[PDB]
Amino acid sequence: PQTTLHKTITPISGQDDKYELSLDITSKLGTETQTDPLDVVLVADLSGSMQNQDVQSFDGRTISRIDALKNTLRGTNGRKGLIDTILSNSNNRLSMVGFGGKIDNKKVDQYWDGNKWRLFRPYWPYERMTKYYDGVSPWDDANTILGWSNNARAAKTAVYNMSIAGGNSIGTESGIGTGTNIGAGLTLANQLMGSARSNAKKVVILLSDGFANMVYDANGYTIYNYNNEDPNIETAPQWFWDRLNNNLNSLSYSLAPTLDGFYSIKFRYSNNVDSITSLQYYMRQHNASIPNEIFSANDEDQLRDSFKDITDKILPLGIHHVSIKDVLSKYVQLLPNGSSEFRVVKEKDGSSEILTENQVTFDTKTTSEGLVEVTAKFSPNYSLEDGARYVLKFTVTSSQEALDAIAGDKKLEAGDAEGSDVNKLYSNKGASVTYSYGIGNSQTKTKEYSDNPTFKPSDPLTVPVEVEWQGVTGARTVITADQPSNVELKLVQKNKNGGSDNQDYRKTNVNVSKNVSNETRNFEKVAKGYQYDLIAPDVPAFTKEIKNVGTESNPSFKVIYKQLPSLTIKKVLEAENNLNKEFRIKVKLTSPDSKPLNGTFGEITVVNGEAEIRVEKRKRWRGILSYLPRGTHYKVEEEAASTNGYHVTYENQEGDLNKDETSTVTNHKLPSLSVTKKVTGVFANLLKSFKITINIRDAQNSPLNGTYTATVNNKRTPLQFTNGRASIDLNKDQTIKIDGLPLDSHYTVEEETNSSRGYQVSYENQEGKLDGDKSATVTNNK
Numbered sequence: 124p125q126t127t128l129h130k131t132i133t134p135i136s137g138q139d140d141k142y143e144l145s146l147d148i149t150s151k152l153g154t155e156t157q158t159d160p161l162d163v164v165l166v167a168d169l170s171g172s173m174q175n176q177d178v179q180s181f182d183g184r185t186i187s188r189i190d191a192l193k194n195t196l197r198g199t200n201g202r203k204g205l206i207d208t209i210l211s212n213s214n215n216r217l218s219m220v221g222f223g224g225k226i227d228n229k230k231v232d233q234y235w236d237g238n239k240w241r242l243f244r245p246y247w248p249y250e251r252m253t254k255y256y257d258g259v260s261p262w263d264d265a266n267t268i269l270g271w272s273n274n275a276r277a278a279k280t281a282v283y284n285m286s287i288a289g290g291n292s293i294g295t296e297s298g299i300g301t302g303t304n305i306g307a308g309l310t311l312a313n314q315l316m317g318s319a320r321s322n323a324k325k326v327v328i329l330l331s332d333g334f335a336n337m338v339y340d341a342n343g344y345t346i347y348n349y350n351n352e353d354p355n356i357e358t359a360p361q362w363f364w365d366r367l368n369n370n371l372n373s374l375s376y377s378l379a380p381t382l383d384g385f386y387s388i389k390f391r392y393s394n395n396v397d398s399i400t401s402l403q404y405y406m407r408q409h410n411a412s413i414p415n416e417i418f419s420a421n422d423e424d425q426l427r428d429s430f431k432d433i434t435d436k437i438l439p440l441g442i443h444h445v446s447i448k449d450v451l452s453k454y455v456q457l458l459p460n461g462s463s464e465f466r467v468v469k470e471k472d473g474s475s476e477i478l479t480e481n482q483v484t485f486d487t488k489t490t491s492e493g494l495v496e497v498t499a500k501f502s503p504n505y506s507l508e509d510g511a512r513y514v515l516k517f518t519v520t521s522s523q524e525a526l527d528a529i530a531g532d533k534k535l536e537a538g539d540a541e542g543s544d545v546n547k548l549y550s551n552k553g554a555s556v557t558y559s560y561g562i563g564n565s566q567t568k569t570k571e572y573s574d575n576p577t578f579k580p581s582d583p584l585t586v587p588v589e590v591e592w593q594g595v596t597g598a599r600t601v602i603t604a605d606q607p608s609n610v611e612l613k614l615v616q617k618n619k620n621g622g623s624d625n626q627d628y629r630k631t632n633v634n635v636s637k638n639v640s641n642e643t644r645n646f647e648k649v650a651k652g653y654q655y656d657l658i659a660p661d662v663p664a665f666t667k668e669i670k671n672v673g674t675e676s677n678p679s680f681k682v683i684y685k686q687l688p689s690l691t692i693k694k695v696l697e698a699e700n701n702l703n704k705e706f707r708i709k710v711k712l713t714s715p716d717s718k719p720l721n722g723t724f725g726e727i728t729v730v731n732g733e734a735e736i737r738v739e740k741r742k743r744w745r746g747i748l749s750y751l752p753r754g755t756h757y758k759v760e761e762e763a764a765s766t767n768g769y770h771v772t773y774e775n776q777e778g779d780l781n782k783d784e785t786s787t788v789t790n791h792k793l794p795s796l797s798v799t800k801k802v803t804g805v806f807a808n809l810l811k812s813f814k815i816t817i818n819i820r821d822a823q824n825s826p827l828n829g830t831y832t833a834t835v836n837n838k839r840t841p842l843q844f845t846n847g848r849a850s851i852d853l854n855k856d857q858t859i860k861i862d863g864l865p866l867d868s869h870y871t872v873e874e875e876t877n878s879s880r881g882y883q884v885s886y887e888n889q890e891g892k893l894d895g896d897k898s899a900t901v902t903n904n905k
């Protein structure tokens with residue numbers, strides 16, 4: 124009648140992105156019924172078999188079936204009995220009826236000729252010939268125990284007065300008989316129901332204990348089935364079956380379209396012949412919409428419960444056939460593996476209990492739009508206690524759509540959120556309750572929830588990024604190289620759905636100040652739910668290393684720049700005179716992977732791991748192979764040509780470049796001997812070749828051997844010394860500078876005797892030690 128609908132979404136505190144939806148409903152009537160008076164007719168088997176003492180009572184005694192139902196209706200000392208139940212409401216009135224058949228028909232006639240009686244005229248298998256008895260009453264196999272009455276006391280007395288017929292039952296005998304003529308009871312019920320209030324709820328409750336062994340004829344005389352003379356053999360001839368089905372059908376045709384409900388209880392049903400089944404069929408044929416059920420009871424307790432069930436279906440607590448439904452918006456989803464804890468809670472006067480599986484079921488359809496429909500279907504018959512709170516509770520989490528939205532990666536459209544605020548996302552697309560009030564699926568109203576709740580997703584992430592600049596040897600060594608002025612960094616978001624990764628998702632630029640080695644900056648509003656990586660510039664002179672120092676779910680990136688090492692070649696000039704000299708130094712460079720190197724590095728270019736440095740005064744006698752790969756192996760050697768005149772020693776000539784190295788080529792100019800020929804007594808001449816022998820012993824006292832560079836007339840020439848003797852030809856006023864002679868060697872100059880042809884030969888510095896540049900002169904006088 125009256126219903127209260129409320130729905131909210133409550134944040135589960137200290138669980139990120141988890142909420143609880145609560146959809147409650149509360150029933151309210153006010154009084155007893157919404158002025159829907161009941162007209163209830165009880166039809167009771169009063170057959171002989173219904174006095175069978177074979178029923179276990181609540182108190183542990185076996186009593187008779189009559190005795191049992193005498194208690195189930197009236198009530199064991201004001202115990203809640205069917206009578207009381209129904210007539211609790213003063214608008215409600217009830218009629219009671221008892222049925223039991225008498226044998227109006229004969230089996231087989233015999234002939235008593237004042238002597239003997241043997242079978243004369245058979246009737247039992249009627250080929251349309253049965254004869255009955257005389258004076259038998261038609262329509263006499265049932266009586267109204269109680270006409271329409273709202274007087275519970277009178278009814279309790281009437282039940283108390285219910286009793287089974289006495290003697291073997293012939294149609295002559297008055298009152299009901301001891302047979303089962305179910306047709307009889309229903310006939311009378313139909314009559315009573317015709318006098319029922321035609322704006323009440325007409326309900327009939329049938330009760331039987333065995334199969335119907337009797338059928339009324341068209342005239343109302345009772346035909347008994349003599350095939351069932353043995354109670355242990357329920358067997359019937361064809362024509363009897365026909366009449367029974369027809370009678371049942373006819374009764375149903377008149378009753379069912381007037382009834383609002385029909386209920387049958389087969390107490391202690393024994394006969395394999397099942398005819399309450401047949402009744403249900405015909406009833407449904409003539410009214411498929413009415414509640415139509417058959418119960419099975421074997422003891423007094425089972426009878427009470429089954430009776431009560433009917434008094435709970437016609438006489439309501441409240442509302443039934445209940446179903447609570449929520450369609451979730453795109454912005455929420457259910458926890459996997461039924462972790463949402465779908466539960467319906469009942470509020471009993473403050474206190475509360477969880478409805479069981481037998482009270483409520485849960486369903487998960489995916490809807491036509493493409494959203495999820497949570498459906499809380501209650502047991503069809505479950506009635507909501509008047510003024511109790513039945514609340515559906517379950518957990519949901521933010522969808523990716525929501526997580527995207529709060530980061531600002533998805534656009535709120537129309538009615539996705541309250542006032543297009545991402546902190547006010549709507550959790551439901553729509554939600555509803557369906558219920559019925561009355562008997563069966565009659566009223567079936569659907570109210571849509573008025574409330575549209577809102578929630579805020581978890582704060583998007585702040586993904587931090589640090590940039591460390593390290594010098595050659597590591598952190599806290601000064602950087603000597605040009606840094607850029609800043610580096611632009613870009614957060615990359617790996618695409619879940621396919622291949623197209625977002626390489627410009629967010630962006631930040633980090634200032635690079637010299638003399639500050641650590642600087643952090645942040646990417647703000649990053650969406651939860653994704654893996655992320657970092658793009659960072661390749662800075663010249665440095666190596667890069669990007670690493671996520673955090674988690675996947677909470678990234679934090681660091682980028683380390685470490686300056687590459689470089690090799691410097693210095694040349695030192697011992698015996699320095701000329702400053703405007705150049706020297707070439709070779710450097711073989713084998714990179715890590717033990718593979719040769721290729722690239723350019725300062726002003727020095729590297730091919731297959733070779734490189735050549737030309738050093739001179741204006742270059743500060745230095746050359747630098749800058750920012751070579753870490754751990755590059757190097758090996759130095761001065762070029763052959765440049766080792767002329769000089770003894771060349773070396774420092775750091777080979778190693779690995781893990782720090783900045785300096786290799787140093789020192790050069791010691793070696794002594795030189797110069798010999799000059801001067802002539803006296805002549806002026807200019809062709810006869811001028813004078814042959815002059817030089818003897819040199821090393822410092823080791825050892826005769827010199829091999830070739831040395833001698834310049835004559837600005838023309839480098841090889842001079843061969845053999846056993847410390849060489850010879851030269853000099854012209855008037857010519858010199859020869861023999862270069863590269865060993866330090867501390869000793870020399871002698873003399874003139875070949877044939878070349879001294881009538882010449883006074885004089886000498887200056889004729890012998891000497893070569894501790895530096897020495898010079899000799901030979902003079903001639905003709």
Ligand SMILES: [Ca+2]
Binds near residue numbers: 227259260264345
């Ligand atoms: Ca009769």
Ligand SMILES: [Mg+2]
Binds near residue numbers: 168170302332
């Ligand atoms: Mg019976």
